[PDB]
Design a protein around this ligand. Sequence first.
Ligand SMILES: OCc1nc2ccccc2[nH]1
Length: 167
Amino acid sequence: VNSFSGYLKLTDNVYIKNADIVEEAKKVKPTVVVNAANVYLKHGGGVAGALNKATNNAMQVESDDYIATNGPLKVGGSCVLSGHNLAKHCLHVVGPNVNKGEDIQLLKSAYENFNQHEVLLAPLLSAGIFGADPIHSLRVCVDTVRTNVYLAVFDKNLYDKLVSSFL
Ligand SMILES: OCc1nc2ccccc2[nH]1
């Protein structure tokens, strides 16, 4: 038994809720929150800017030091950093950005990062401003992630479409 409340169960291991991933993290303080990162860990908007704003920019300060030491992530890759006031840890995962021409096949590689963590609070990778079809992202998530994932879908309209079209 864990502290996640109000989720619809899609599969043995995948759960979904209409919620802002930021308010959910503040309430639950999960072990792992996933950020929809880019390779530069430049958290300007979407999930990353909203998460970073909730940390009062501490996420960006830590991320800049990480990049200065290690260089950019790979598309499909990840790193583990602090969760600040939101979670124990933040798993920064880079899904392909369709609005930059990145191979959508890299979405499965991105979701494979989640398998290194027993339980995660996450957004749909490559959705929102990353330009992928969220229905596709949920299918890849279900078919790739074997650990327990709690998906926060910010848009109520999209949430209802994801549930009602789920196979
Ligand atoms: O704080 C406004 C907000 N923008 C968001 C974008 C993506 C996910 C959650 C968000 N919350």
